[model samples]
Structure formats: C-alpha cells, structure tokens
Target: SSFSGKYQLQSQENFEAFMKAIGLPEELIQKGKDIKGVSEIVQNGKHFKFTITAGSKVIQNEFTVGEEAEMETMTGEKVKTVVQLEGDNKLVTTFKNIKSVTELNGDIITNTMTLGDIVFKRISKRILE
Candidate 1:
C-alpha cells in the first residue's frame, strides 16, 4: 500500500526505473525530473490523486475506482480511465486516450505496480467480494 499514499517524483532515482518501464522518452524524463520537487500523490482508499507543478505550470489528476472511470484534472477537465480485474490477483487499469492497460498484480506482487499489456477493454463486469 506504499503507493496508496502521497508521493513526489523526487529524483531520477525516484522515477527513472518506472518511467523507463513505461517507455517514457529522455526529454520527458528530464522535464519531469526538473519538476520533481513540485509533484505529489495522494491515494484515499481506491481513489488516487496526483498534483504536479513544473515551475509555473501545474497539473493534477484525480482518479476513482471501477470500470470506465473519469479522472478530474486540475483545470476541471474529465479524462477517462478504465479499471478491470484480471484473473483473481490482477487489476487491469487503462487510462483514457492511452492505448496501454497497466496490470496491477496483488498475489504475485505485494505492492500495486503495473505489468505490461497494450490491450484496452473490460474482460468482465462482476466484482469479487
């Protein structure tokens, strides 16, 4: 649940590996690094929130749980994202406009992190209790 709390992109060491895993470019990485000190993350239960400031520019993301979600931006824009469970241990997450679904495995992985997959769409509608 470490990722369930607020986190800032502190250094290259803070996000380099994850950024690399997600195929972010060097230019983007450097830009993100430069604003590392101004970024923060907050997760309340199944809801996730991110706030980032790049010098004078600021960005934010507010996310909630379930399939076909909408993320509220700092500017009050709504961006869509999908959340679907895969198998018994994996949670498949898809951000709107992005073609990739990041898989979060709970059994094989204790921390909620992504596994790679380019597929988008929900596999089922039933929620396990």
Candidate 2:
C-alpha cells in the first residue's frame, strides 16, 4: 500500500499554534518543535499499525478502519476514535474538536490538522528502510 512505509518529518507549518490550541504543556510543545519525528505505518487491508517516534518518545497503536480504538495523542491524551478512509490514500479521523486528514502522495505523507480555528500541516517524506 502507498501509505505503508516509514516516513521522516521534513517540515511543519503553524505547528506551535495548533499545539497551543490543543492545550499541550509548554515543555512538550517545545520538545515537539525541536524534534524531527519518524513514523512507520503497516497496513493490512482495513487494519493498520502505526509507530511514531518523536524526540525521546515512541508511541504505537493499532486500529481498523471504521472501528473505535483508544488512541493516544502526541500530548499523551488518550481518546477513543474511529479512523476511516476518505479515498484510497487518505486516512481521516477526528478527536474532540480536532480533525485530522492524512494523505499519501507518492513518497510523501501530508497531515492537515484542524483544531477549532487553527490549522497546521506536517509533511513527511518516505524513507527507505
């Protein structure tokens, strides 16, 4: 699958504002701003496993499309969520007031996140493992 790969963060736009909007702690926000995250996705049909490493923290989760699972955010908040596909390459999910849309394009993955009136984008490039 196009979305099944390892990716390294390349750039981000308005990330701090979005973090603040989500009420993340100041230290966590600073650490996030200073680190380049790596994400690995493994997909089998409608089931997916995601591993993400940022700074000194590593988080992993498994879920199936359209099924609810307890997911932990970057800020360490656990929330029940259901992830679905908008198309063949887009994974869409929402938590509280935040909406997350992840799109896979070629060797790049772009995540567009919206929290209230704040929106941010994170772009990552696929890495050869």
Candidate 3:
C-alpha cells in the first residue's frame, strides 16, 4: 500500500505559532521549525504503525481503524485516540482537544492538526516504498 512507505517532510506551515498555542516551550518550537523529518509507516490489513523521526526525537504510534489506542504525541505524551479511515485516503482523529486529519494522494501526504483557531499543517512525499 502507498501508505506503507517512508515519507520525508516537504514543508510545514504555522509551526511556531501553533506550537506556542499548544503550550510547547519556545526552545522546542525553534528546534522543530526548520527540521525536515521522516515518517515510516507499516500498514498490514487493518493495523497501522507509524514512526516519525525529526533529528533525534522519535514518536511512534500504533492503531487499528475504528479502535481506540494510545498514540505518542509530539511532546512524547501518550494519548488515547481512535483513528478512522474516510474518503478512501483520509485518516481522521481527535485527541487532547486537537483535531487531526491526514489525507494521502499519490506520493503526497498532507497532515493537518487544528486546535481552535490555530492550525499546523505539514506535507510529506513518499520517498521509499
């Protein structure tokens, strides 16, 4: 599946402001702003495993569609959430008052995280299959 691949971040928007809105420290925000991260995914039937690496920091998440599971956040905090697949290529979930939606189209993956009026978006392109 296209979702089971290695994707490198192509771009991000509103990182600093949105992170601050999320209450992340300024130092953490600065370190992540210019980072070009890589996310590796393994999809096997209904189960999905995702590992995202930015510099030395890594966040791992595992879940199955429609089932609640604990997922690692950017701050390494674990949050229970249920991820549902919709529209053939969209993963929708809500955790800790943040709304997350990720859509995949061909080689591109766009992840949108929204909390209130603040939004942080990132785009990644599949670089390995």
Candidate 4:
C-alpha cells in the first residue's frame, strides 16, 4: 500500500525535540514546544519521517512518492533522515543529528532510487559459481 497523506500523532512532545535536534526552525519549535497532545504531519513521498522520542515513547511518520511535508524545530544544523517501507506494516528509518553536504548527498543517492539512476541504484554486483 502506498502511504501518501496526513497522519496525526498519538503523542506530540515525543518527537518535537528530535525534530529540533535535527535542525528544525525556531518558529516551528516554539509552535510545538508547549503543546502536549497530538501533532499532525502532511506527507506525500518526498518528505522524510520525523523520528520522535520523548522519555520512553517514540513515533515515526512517513509518506509515499510525490509527498511534501513540514515540521517545527528548535535550531541549528539541518539533520538528515532516511526512511524505508518494510514488509507489510513496518517503516524503518534512521536519523542523523549532525550532517555535512557530502554525507547528505551520499544518503540521498543510497536511499532514494529512481527508474534508471546509476549513482546509487540499489544493485549489488557479484558472480555466482
């Protein structure tokens, strides 16, 4: 199934800090700082999931192709996120708190795959005997 819509958070505070740590803007952080309930996310496919963990609770949100998203953050260094749809009901993702341009580029290539993109196409080369 293709994931391509808005998902409201079961918990808001849980993921806000994660977002801020990953370089979210100050206004966004301020908007969600005091709120302690639900957080709504608009996702298509282009956007990555915001991995949230407050205390012991964690939330992951992702979208399908052509999706655009937005989130609030506290400040500094735009972090990176890698999301993958796994199995039937699982979405695997990773968050890089501090990142460089090259690292981000490599990540984009390694993860996001198109029809004929050769740079980071997910193909393994080997010889079977």
Write model 1 residue lDDT over 5-96, tens digit each, in one string. Answer: 23333223234445555555666656654453434446566665656453234667666557466755323456676655455344455443
Q: Pick the candidate with the highest lDDT.
A: 2
- C-alpha lDDT values of all predictions: 0.43, 0.86, 0.84, 0.33
- Which pairs clash in the backbone of model 3? none
Extract clashing residue pairs from model 4: 15-52, 44-67, 45-64, 45-67
Score residue 107 of candidate 3 by CA lDDT. Answer: 92
What TM-score would candidate 2 get against the native?
0.91
Model 2 residue runs over 4 Å out of place are 54-56
| Model 1 ranges off by over 4 Å | 11-33, 54-56, 72-78, 84-92, 96-129
In the order shown, the candidates' Cα RMSDs to the true structure are 10.0, 1.5, 1.6, 14.8
**TM-score of every model?**
0.39, 0.91, 0.92, 0.31
Encode model 4's per-residue lDDT on 1-129: one tens digit a residue. 323222222222223445444445666656655543322233344444544332233455444422332332224223344444555323444333322111122112112221122221121111111
Candidate with the larger lDDT of 1 and 2: 2
Determine which window of 10 residues in candidate 1 has minimal summed lDDT: 119-128
Clashes of 3: 0
TM-score head-to-head 1 vs 4, winner: 1
Worst 10 residues of 4 by lDDT: 100-109
Task: Judging by TM-score, tell me the better candidate of 3 and 4.
Answer: 3
RMSD of 1: 10.0
